[PDB]
Enzyme design. Structure first.
Site, PDB file in Angstrom:
ATOM      1  N   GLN A 188      93.037  44.310  69.507  1.00 55.65           N
ATOM      2  CA  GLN A 188      93.531  43.430  68.455  1.00 55.65           C
ATOM      3  C   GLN A 188      94.066  44.125  67.214  1.00 55.65           C
ATOM      4  O   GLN A 188      94.802  43.502  66.439  1.00 55.65           O
ATOM      5  CB  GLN A 188      92.433  42.488  67.998  1.00 55.65           C
ATOM      6  CG  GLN A 188      92.027  41.451  69.008  1.00 55.65           C
ATOM      7  CD  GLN A 188      91.089  40.461  68.382  1.00 55.65           C
ATOM      8  OE1 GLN A 188      89.859  40.619  68.455  1.00 55.65           O
ATOM      9  NE2 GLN A 188      91.651  39.443  67.726  1.00 55.65           N
ATOM     10  N   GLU A 221      85.158  38.621  72.922  1.00 58.67           N
ATOM     11  CA  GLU A 221      85.608  39.983  72.627  1.00 58.67           C
ATOM     12  C   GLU A 221      85.816  40.802  73.899  1.00 58.67           C
ATOM     13  O   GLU A 221      86.818  41.504  74.031  1.00 58.67           O
ATOM     14  CB  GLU A 221      84.640  40.679  71.675  1.00 58.67           C
ATOM     15  CG  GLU A 221      84.565  40.011  70.319  1.00 58.67           C
ATOM     16  CD  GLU A 221      85.940  39.578  69.813  1.00 58.67           C
ATOM     17  OE1 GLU A 221      86.954  40.252  70.135  1.00 58.67           O
ATOM     18  OE2 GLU A 221      86.019  38.547  69.098  1.00 58.67           O
ATOM     19  N   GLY A 255      84.001  38.491  65.326  1.00 55.99           N
ATOM     20  CA  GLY A 255      84.119  39.593  66.292  1.00 55.99           C
ATOM     21  C   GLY A 255      85.518  40.163  66.227  1.00 55.99           C
ATOM     22  O   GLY A 255      86.470  39.485  65.779  1.00 55.99           O
TER      23      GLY A 255
END
Lengths: 170, 170
Positions: B51, B142, B46
């Protein structure tokens, strides 16, 4: 002789270490001597015996100048067996901690600002000192290792936990 | 185009990301396409937009075979915007999590075993699915990124937190 520092995740850092019972021994002196050497090569401020996989209540610490801190004040070079710690006030203080069993990382950790610690020099003579601030933090940190505790489990503010080269918290 | 994955400590992972408001857009498609590419090169299961330093409620995930898990079951390749999550039972389950914003490490984390998640495919059509186990964990993980949370702050048992190559917990 420089020892391998074992890293976080190694069961051996999770142990409650037994007391040192060979004060004054040539064996114990060789072990501490290795400890200072290992701490020095890795630029540590403290090193607990379990971090080199020796299951004993023993720690070394101290430095004139830290590459790592940098501007922490000097802490005297100390080897201390059978550490026991008492706080002298309730006042807590936040500061950066890191671990050579945890390279790359750091976090802010509350510790007691004021402690007395007690134990033994490797020759067997007794040590008792009162300490504060960074001095006190180092000794609290190394002590946690003797009781199978690492710093992540003391983090209150997770925003402050990260890689040394990436962090920008005050 | 592979994006740099930013590492833990970067303030940008601490943000609460705003909604995606350009569904169906060529810009959004290019961004997701980069996301899958980045996740794939790093062997992720994921990847949340923050990120790669894009402050949006967007995540990709899924895989046939994981090098990392390995024997997690297949999760379908999904890109999901404006994720919102509801648990379907109180049952929690412990499993290993890791993060490419946290390389080398892992820990065991309790998550809901059963969830429904809702949001949008990049073309704008609605997605709602019920998921369980590893599927559900990935989407919970996530999602935390979208709300500026990382996995250390969910660890209950610190004995299980360590470097992937050193851990030996069940």
């Amino acid at each position: 002789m420089i020892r391998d520092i074992i890293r976080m995740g190694d069961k051996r850092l999770l142990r409650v270490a037994p007391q040192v019972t060979n004060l004054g021994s040539a064996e114990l002196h060789a072990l501490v001597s290795d400890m200072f050497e290992t701490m020095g090569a890795a630029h540590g401020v403290g090193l607990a015996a379990p971090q080199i996989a020796v299951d004993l209540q023993l720690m070394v610490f101290g430095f004139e100048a830290s590459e790592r801190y940098p501007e922490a004040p000097a802490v005297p070079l100390t080897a201390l067996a059978n550490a026991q710690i008492e706080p002298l006030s309730d006042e807590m203080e936040n500061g950066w901690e890191g671990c050579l069993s945890i390279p790359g990382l750091r976090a802010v950790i509350p510790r007691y600002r004021y402690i007395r610690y007690r134990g033994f020099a490797p020759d067997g003579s007794p040590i008792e000192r009162e300490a504060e601030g960074f001095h006190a933090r180092v000794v609290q940190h190394e002590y946690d290792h003797l009781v199978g505790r690492l710093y992540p489990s003391r983090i209150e503010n997770f925003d402050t936990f990260g890689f040394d080269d990436v962090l920008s918290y005050d």
